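@here heads up, posting the sequence + SMILES for the magnesium ion run so it's all in one place. Ping me if the SMILES looks off, I pulled it from an old spreadsheet.
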Amino acid sequence: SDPSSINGGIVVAMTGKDCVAIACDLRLGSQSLGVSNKFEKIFHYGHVFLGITGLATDVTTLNEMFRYKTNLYKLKEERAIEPETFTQLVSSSLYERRFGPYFVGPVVAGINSKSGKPFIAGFDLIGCIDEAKDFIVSGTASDQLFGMCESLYEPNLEPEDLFETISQALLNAADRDALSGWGAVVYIIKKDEVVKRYLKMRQD
Amino acid sequence: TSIMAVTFKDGVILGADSRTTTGAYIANRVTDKLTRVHDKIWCCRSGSAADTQAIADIVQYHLELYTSQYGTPSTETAASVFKELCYENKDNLTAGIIVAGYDDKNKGEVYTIPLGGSVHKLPYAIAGSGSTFIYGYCDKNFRENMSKEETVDFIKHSLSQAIKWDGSSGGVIRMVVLTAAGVERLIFYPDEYEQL
Amino acid sequence: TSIMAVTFKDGVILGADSRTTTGAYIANRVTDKLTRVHDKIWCCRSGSAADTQAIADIVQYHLELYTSQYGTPSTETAASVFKELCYENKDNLTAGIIVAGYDDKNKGEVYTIPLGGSVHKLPYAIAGSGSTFIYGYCDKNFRENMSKEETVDFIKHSLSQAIKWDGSSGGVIRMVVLTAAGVERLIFYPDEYEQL
Amino acid sequence: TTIVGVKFNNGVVIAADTRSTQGPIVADKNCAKLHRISPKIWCAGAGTAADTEAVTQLIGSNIELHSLYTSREPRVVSALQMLKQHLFKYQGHIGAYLIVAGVDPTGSHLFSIHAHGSTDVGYYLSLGSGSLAAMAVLESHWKQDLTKEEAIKLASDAIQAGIWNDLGSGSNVDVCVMEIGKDAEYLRNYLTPNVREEKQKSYKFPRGTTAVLKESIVNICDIQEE
Amino acid sequence: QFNPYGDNGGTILGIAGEDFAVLAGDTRNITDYSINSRYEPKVFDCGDNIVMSANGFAADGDALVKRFKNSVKWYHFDHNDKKLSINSAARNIQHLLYSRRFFPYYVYNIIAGLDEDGKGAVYSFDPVGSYQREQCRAGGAAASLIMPFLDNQVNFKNQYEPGTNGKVKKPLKYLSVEEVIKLVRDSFTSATERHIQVGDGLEILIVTKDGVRKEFYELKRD
Amino acid sequence: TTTLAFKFQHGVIAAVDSRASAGSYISALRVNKVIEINPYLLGTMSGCAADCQYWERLLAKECRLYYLRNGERISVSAASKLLSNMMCQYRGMGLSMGSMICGWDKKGPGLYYVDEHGTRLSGNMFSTGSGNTYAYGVLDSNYKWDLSVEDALYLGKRSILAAAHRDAYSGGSVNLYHVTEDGWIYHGNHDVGELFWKVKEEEGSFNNVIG
Amino acid sequence: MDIILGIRVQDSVILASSKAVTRGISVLKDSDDKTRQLSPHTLMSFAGEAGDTVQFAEYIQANIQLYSIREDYELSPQAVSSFVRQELAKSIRSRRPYQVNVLIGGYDKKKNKPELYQIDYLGTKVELPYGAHGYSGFYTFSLLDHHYRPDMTTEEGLDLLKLCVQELEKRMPMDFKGVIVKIVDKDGIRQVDDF
Amino acid sequence: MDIILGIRVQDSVILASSKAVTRGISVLKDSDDKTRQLSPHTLMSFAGEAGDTVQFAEYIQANIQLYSIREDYELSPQAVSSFVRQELAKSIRSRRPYQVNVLIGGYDKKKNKPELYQIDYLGTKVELPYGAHGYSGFYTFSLLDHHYRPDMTTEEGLDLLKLCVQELEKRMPMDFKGVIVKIVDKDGIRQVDDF
Amino acid sequence: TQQPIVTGTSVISMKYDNGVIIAADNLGSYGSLLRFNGVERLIPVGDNTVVGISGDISDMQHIERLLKDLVTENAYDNPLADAEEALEPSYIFEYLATVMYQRRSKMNPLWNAIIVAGVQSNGDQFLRYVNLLGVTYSSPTLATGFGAHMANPLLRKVVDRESDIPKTTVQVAEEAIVNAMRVLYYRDARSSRNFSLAIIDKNTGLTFKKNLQVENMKWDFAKDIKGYGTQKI
Ligand SMILES: *[C@@](C)(CO)[C@](*)(O)[C@H](Cc1ccccc1)NC(=O)[C@H](Cc1c[nH]c2ccccc12)NC(=O)[C@@H](C)NC(=O)CN1CCOCC1
Ligand SMILES: *[C@@](C)(CO)[C@](*)(O)[C@H](Cc1ccccc1)NC(=O)[C@H](Cc1c[nH]c2ccccc12)NC(=O)[C@@H](C)NC(=O)CN1CCOCC1
Ligand SMILES: [Mg+2]
Ligand SMILES: [Mg+2]
Ligand SMILES: [Mg+2]
Ligand SMILES: [Mg+2]
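bot reply: prediction finished. Complex structure tokens:
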């Protein structure tokens, strides 16, 4: 019944030293039934990454919508959108449906191409921005992720160390959530190279 | 309903209207809400008529049996019996009772027992749906150790206003005077009290 | 809330308490419930603060525009604008307003507008949750053509009792005097009115 | 949340805590509740977080356009009127409870405003879940003719009462001082009484601890030449 | 309508070592958004080298502990001062809880001590009496925050040995009391940051063959 | 949960998962959903954990008393019936308990399904819990009476795996039991995480999943 | 309606759909075809609330047929599935949503690949090797997880499908009156008349 | 449970009862016997809420068996049916009523007549030539009204019963997994193993 | 199950170096009506304990009688009733807490919140809370109802933790309590100006103060406040 927990799923993002990381599980379900183990929840518009949890139809719909808006932004501005600007666009777009909202928990991650500064942000289903320095969590195992991130995280981690920390935060949180799991992906993001890794996890 | 009990120099006086309603229909316009539980211990009844009658009948039985064994009961004792019934059966009752009595030792005493079953000893008390409209008037005009005639006028004026504003109150004003001299019943008709 | 407006020889006086509650919490203890819609036309507000503020702001706009075109509006005209808003939007409002004003031709006038949106012109009016406790007192003590000092004492004593018994009422007593001489604001603190 | 507003000699000061909640969970530990409507008009918000931000930005946008149209500096009564009429129209569904304060050519002002559209004037005000803890402090220590330094102290003390005693409030204290004839000074993290102690252990993992299936480079660049 | 239940918050944590056991819990007591007490003990020494904590609705928690302590007393009287083993205590508590199957003790219960072979033992209960022996268990408000951290840092879940790439797991080496207390303190510090009902103080009870020892640590009071 | 049990040539197989839920939160990774009532009787558990434990441990009390009075082991039919009669006393009171009573007695191997309604069914194959539908699919297509003990143990193991994969409220680990006329035999605890990958490679199944 | 299954094999997509239609306590029809051809190489099966199913299907059919005539070109299965998803995602926030779940089986002539898309009434799209709607997956997915390979022939796909229907017929309480099976491949759409 | 039928012919009573038992969305058993022998020449079939059915049936069985031993005599079908009705009429005003509908088929050895009694959970008893509980009668009674004679043989009764089951299998949405048929005559009770 | 009719509001208390202080106003409210103005809600038990009660007044009067009967019963066959075997605050509290929890377990609660304040035989301070649910807790400061929200924050500025108790004098503690009662009068709509205050000291014994009033109130600033926004007159 609760739209935010029908399909299940989680997203987490972290900052490091001159880098960011964003990760998600791959499950899509109909309550107890697992339907897909390839439902990726992370999208990118240029060098800006967006993770979305919640109702899968709205996840899909919002991706198509932000692709639409960022493609027009680029044609008019003659440049790719930055994370700080995109964050405001997400907030604007969500609040315009204040009384009929998308049931989602978006997460923005990226590096400003000009300043080189790492950036992450989280939102509620209505647009309130949570701009954190350390990490952002979203999904059905958000409580679990908060406990993992808050104890495992330390600032100024190097990309290859940050990978291990975010991966373990996701994996162990997902293993205490019935509605999350069935695979996982981690994006490691630097100013001009991005690596994507699929994790091996238990498939129950 | 509009009921009150007031202590004064020589004892205590109970007062009440005479209207009983079933919604907006006046089922009885000459009701006697001043009921005797002992020779010089009376009560004013408000709330469910069935409940308050049943209680007062039981109390009258208890005080009759008390008297047979231990002699004349105090007004405090009567109020305790009322309380014990109202408090222990609070889930199934809707009764707001004022108890008033005269001793020679304690003179005039007034106890009020609202819905919950708590007891409150007071110089004077007001209760019923019509009491709300005269809290200000009664507080401003009440004095301790009034005369009989002053106290009658105080109750008459007070209930006159309660009747004026409350639709659930009306009819005649009945009063019962409790002193060493005995027990006096009074009655005041609309043509008298409406022109006040 | 406890509010009232009283006509007298030289004009009219509005009075109010200063308590605003959110349940049992006093959100504001120094509220100004006496609000100006025109130079010498004021209103007392009761009910939803949001609703009564929105209304009074709209009325003030209507009377400002009336004045620009047709000159100074009557107190009856102001009450009609209040009524029109309260009556036509009765399903979405919870507003009980007393309107009071001074003309040189009509002198002091008082109109009350209860929940439904009906209008009632009166010598004096009381409203708010605390008004219930002083219906008896005010009826007994009000006289027509009182002096300014008598009228101030009448309102002071009346609201004193309303505050005494009503928990939703309290704080200071504010008053606004409307005469030919002008507009006078008065204030009375607890230490003054509590000992009455 | 806990938010307060305090008037003083030559101006007005507002303050707020920095905790944001999703039920019993803390979403943000260093949230910013002090919003700018105009340069010298700031408001603090409690209730639905998105609503306090959105309604503040909207009115702030319209106030800026108004200021440009009239060639005048914006007034607090304008922001107040625009806010209450907007909130009233939505009949409480926009859950924004705000303390609005500022200085303008008329002087210094302090108002509170509820979600249903009712406004309120005062020398000292408090809103939010910790408003009672804060108001207890304000009622104990407030006086007439406060200095700037006394008012900042009173304001932050009132927020601390909320931080310590209210579970819906916590972390740091934000302040904004608006004095007449001066620029408004926004004191972000004026107090920091809730720094986390050092952890007993480091949970940095050995590289290669996590099991991986596939790796791939992600093309973020545009389509290339040649 | 009268609601006989309430929520007093709090969080508890039990960890079993090789020859020891710990039972920790925060000392904060709350209703809604108010703090009742910053120091209200929640973990108790029940005798016979057994420690216990009933987290959730304080009134039901105090009643259960009180009854179990009483059950220990009568076990001595009836069975010639015999020591109540941890496994026997656990089973007894199941029956105490199921007595109210249709008006439950609204609490999550953990006990800790040593088994009859001297090894560390932790037992966990739901409100209606299902119990299990466990190596690790967090209960209460921030249980979902802490348990995943313990799966990772106590049982080395999802952790493998570098160079093998997922082929060989991290071996399950035992933890010392000093290492466990570090994980306990970091668990509660992290829980205090992100959970509003957790804070003020942390009280740990450590059980060994020598007896029951206490340790107290401050937590953030916001 | 997912539980199953089936009769065959060489007794009865019983397999269960190990997950426990508290809504979406996985409260336990490794709970024991089988009770060793006696050396020749087993009981599976599905539903309210407290009810399953209390009533089946009470059943074990009643089965032991039967042995002392009659000097003879209780039948599977009689044991299942005692349990179903307990359920009928608390009929409508809100118990939640689904269980299979597996064992070997004089009539040979025995298997009974019992639930909180007082239902008592004799049969060759049963599966209970949230993930029973997935288990039935594998069982129905591969079951024979002519199964070897080695193949039968694998079938029950593989059937739980199927359910653990698809059902969100099933998983953790697999517990196997084999009941003979010399008594039941525990055949270990098997982690689903490790078992899934092992089965995927060896069997070739779960092609859709990437590993 | 009740059960709709789908499986994508090496060189084709196979859709199986129940034949039953029930009004009240009576089965009105036992030969109902719960499918519509959207284009020569694209087939859509459907299941949901009475009336809405056919309406929606025919509305989609008309739109795709209109596109085909206008451009003289067949849309890819992916393109059609995205159009269908948008129409459902548009529908879920309408005054009265269309309560329809669909499977879209198509053969992409450009890529020479079969494709199966599962879309529910909310507009939740997923590409799958095999899929189902409602309770059908609860019984069948365990068999498909075990037996499915991507290099299966059409004949092997039909045999695995028979096993799925047999399991449904054993463990489902409802009698769905068998299934109509249709195959979608490079040569187009055809019906298996004996099943 | 679901479907229970009964028909009284010339010299016997025939009871047909479904084999299915369902828990949740899964059919647990397809060979369940929804009947109990009360005495050598009296059979009772039953259908209703889970658990209550068997409990009630076994409780009745125990009472009739106790009577048989005490008096060394078999109660008439009429007497047994009246005892059963009273137990149900007693039950309907209890704290928690037994939600069970029954058919009682018996052969009266004194009168040399077959007898069929239909009793619902309220304690509503009726003697009939043919009967059913639940929705079963909605489909079958029209056939029985048309084809039934009182001088029918047991074989003709079985053929008419087959026609009733075929109609149920065509028009009922639920799969009840066929029926177990039992015959009650002068020689006692026997089961038709092929149907 | 019932509903409270005539009610008493906040009871506030705190520990200081040599004892405890407890206070409560003298009002008995009937919903929004301030019906009864002479109600004592602090009830002494012996010369070493004061029980402060909020909530339903009829249930308070019932508890008042249980305590009076407890004293009577303790004196029975007890030569040391006024010495070693006198009633202790901990005895009185545990009795009440047993009663409160039993009543809630029968779904017929005493609709109250109680604070038992006193000094034990060994001079130790006793301060513990119990309510209609049988929930119990102890703290250096305790308060019921509105007092929990407004008084505790002020009293915790004086005694924030256990180590602050020996540093707190009776003059400072009384001052803090009296200030808190003033704040509650400003802000609690079901409160009164008149209140009672009790001090239980280990040296000077029980001091029971009646007919106290809230004084030194700030209202003058109200004259300057006009309208609700734009109004100037
Ligand atoms: C205190 C923490 C108490 O809430 C403050 O008022 C704080 C105010 C604030 C203002 C600006 C930025 C950050 C914080 N409020 C919140 O943090 C607020 C608490 C909250 C949660 N649900 C509420 C419903 C009604 C009123 C307050 C509520 N947080 C939020 O609003 C954030 C976390 N958003 C949500 O929780 C999402 N909600 C959107 C509307 O639909 C319900 C869910
Ligand atoms: C699936 C996992 C269903 O979710 C199983 O049926 C499982 C069965 C089971 C049986 C015996 C022991 C453990 C588990 N059931 C549960 O896990 C059960 C599901 C559940 C939750 N609420 C229910 C209400 C009615 C019926 C079932 C319900 N969960 C529980 O019982 C939860 C509430 N209890 C525990 O997790 C208790 N833990 C205490 C410490 O020991 C481990 C169990
Ligand atoms: Mg699973
Ligand atoms: Mg009248
Ligand atoms: Mg706090
Ligand atoms: Mg019938």
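MO: Helices of chain D lie at 49-70, 76-89, 131-141, 148-165.
MO: One more: DSSP finds four helices and 13 strands in chain D.
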